[PDB]
Amino acid sequence: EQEDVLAKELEDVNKWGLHVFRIAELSGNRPLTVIMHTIFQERDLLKTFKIPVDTLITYLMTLEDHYHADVAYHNNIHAADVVQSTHVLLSTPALEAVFTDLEILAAIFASAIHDVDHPGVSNQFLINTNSELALMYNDSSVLENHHLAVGFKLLQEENCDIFQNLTKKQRQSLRKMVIDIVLATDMSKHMNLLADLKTMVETKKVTSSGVLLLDNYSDRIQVLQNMVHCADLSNPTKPLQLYRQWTDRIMEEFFRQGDRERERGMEISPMCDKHNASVEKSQVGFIDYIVHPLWETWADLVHPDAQDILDTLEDNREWYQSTI
Amino acid sequence: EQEDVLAKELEDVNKWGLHVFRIAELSGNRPLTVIMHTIFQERDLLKTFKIPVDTLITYLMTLEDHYHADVAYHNNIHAADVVQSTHVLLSTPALEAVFTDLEILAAIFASAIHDVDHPGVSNQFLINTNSELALMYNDSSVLENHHLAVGFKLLQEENCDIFQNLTKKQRQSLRKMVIDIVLATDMSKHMNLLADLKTMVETKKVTSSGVLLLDNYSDRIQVLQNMVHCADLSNPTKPLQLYRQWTDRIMEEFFRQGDRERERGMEISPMCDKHNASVEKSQVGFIDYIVHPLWETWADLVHPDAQDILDTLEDNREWYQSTI
Lengths: 324, 324
Ligand SMILES: CCOc1cc(/C=C2/C(=O)Oc3cc(O)ccc32)ccc1OC
Ligand SMILES: CCOc1cc(/C=C2\C(=O)Oc3cc(O)ccc32)ccc1OC
Ligand SMILES: [Mg+2]
Ligand SMILES: [Mg+2]
Ligand SMILES: [Zn+2]
Ligand SMILES: [Zn+2]
Description:
homodimer, 324 residues, mainly alpha, Catalytic domain of cyclic nucleotide phosphodiesterase 4b2b, binds the ligand CCOc1cc(/C=C2/C(=O)Oc3cc(O)ccc32)ccc1OC, binds magnesium ion, binds zinc ion, hydrolase, Inhibitor
């Protein structure tokens, strides 16, 4: 029974290193729909926010349909992966729960739409090719603004408004939080985001029970920004067999961008030249300069709830280094 | 001939208080085209940037077409007025030889497109009514992002690329400057923009020729941002018979938005209720809390160049107050 094996894999929905590619395979290329549906049922969110299950499934299906099947990395599997990853980091003891049912709905919904309709090329490529997207969004977080616009737009399709029974004030607060979160997935925001995460760790305050003490929205949205950002950058922290599949996919997507750049005689973007790549050195550099500094700071913030995640990252870094 | 009178009126293009409304009538409702053309000729700009005169006229007419002839204030007359005001502010003695031809071109071009395709309603209205515009731009500088997208997009129409002979670095630099400037016209940026301008005035450096010293992009763009912002908020600084017609038009536009709001059961925005608005009191508050703090700070930046403009503003403030 297909549906039995799928049901069994989804029993790991609360675990880092959730088996996501087989869930993709077993669900008929519907990992975003089935993982979101599971997390919503797991979190009682359909009953809390009076979401008709058919409206939930209708939207998730349409949303998943607007992820490109022919994009190697930024597709529905990556969205499902970021959703489930955010789902875990929300339930860390040092934060669980400290985010209301609305900001939890925000981080999850934002994770689900955060790359929707991704064309498989970078903001810089879109800027350099005088794309309609870069023309629309004035070269600023072009992809991320588009992801938001599509993710919200699809709510207006027939029987897709999963927020229909939220109050108008809940809809507004949720909308702002989702926008704030998704716009923060733009990698050009990473350094300022991490600096602000570091500042917060230095002035950190917690319960004796352990729960982190955040008072104002400015700090709570910033933890949710860095959380989804961490989930977006969580591939090198997953078990190696998952990590290596993500590396294959992102390198395939980079390489095809470099193919489009070479056809047009454009400068080939970093890591995008399949005739001049070092996949392994790139992963080590990626970990050393982006992923580990971010996850070391996040681990401090939720100390010690992220130790196993951080441990896996450092094991994977050591392994990739050893392939050089 | 009607063109003899138009040409005579266009001899005032370097003067504060040019009668832009007469020029609007005398030009067959083409104040933006004729004023931009006059200014480009006055500043040597078609020669400096190899702009074909037919390309300039064609783009200007297409750009002017995309201002709404049905909107009382945010129409082509306002665009021409802001162009011409920015043109005058660029020529202030404290700024001679400061800005490059490309920066001057960026500021004037930004002024020309800065409100194109304005629907006559506020950002908050577009947000609150779930407009397609607010959906596209995620509730952030909705109008101002749209003005930019339309203004740049129209350069791609037939024989409309007035920048066709700029170098690649010139267009890239101009595009970024235009974006930075138009985004700064969003009133939600005003307080931070003004706070930055205050700081610049307090720490101001001049050259040995008494001219403002602008060391870097951040300071140069911020002066151009506030300059165009001042031109955008320059109505109360104009001779009273010009100011008063601007007040008639903005109140008309506000009231027509308030009608749309009062229909939908929405809370009518401040100053949009024709059955409960004080035109005179709103002008005094507008000057006291927005326009005068801005123009007094701009006057300090270029002191004493702008004393007559500041004097007129204070006289007009006096006059509106006297009618209460
Ligand atoms: C070596 C890169 O590896 C990955 C990058 C990414 C993503 C990136 C992206 O979208 O934009 C970047 C810009 C950068 O400077 C660095 C990384 C990224 C994901 C998985 C990877 O490996 C599994
Ligand atoms: C009492 C207000 O009077 C005026 C306002 C305005 C302008 C603006 C306004 O009310 O909101 C804005 C938001 C923006 O982003 C840019 C400009 C404006 C112009 C003339 C007036 O009177 C002659
Ligand atoms: Mg993304
Ligand atoms: Mg405007
Ligand atoms: Zn992503
Ligand atoms: Zn304006």
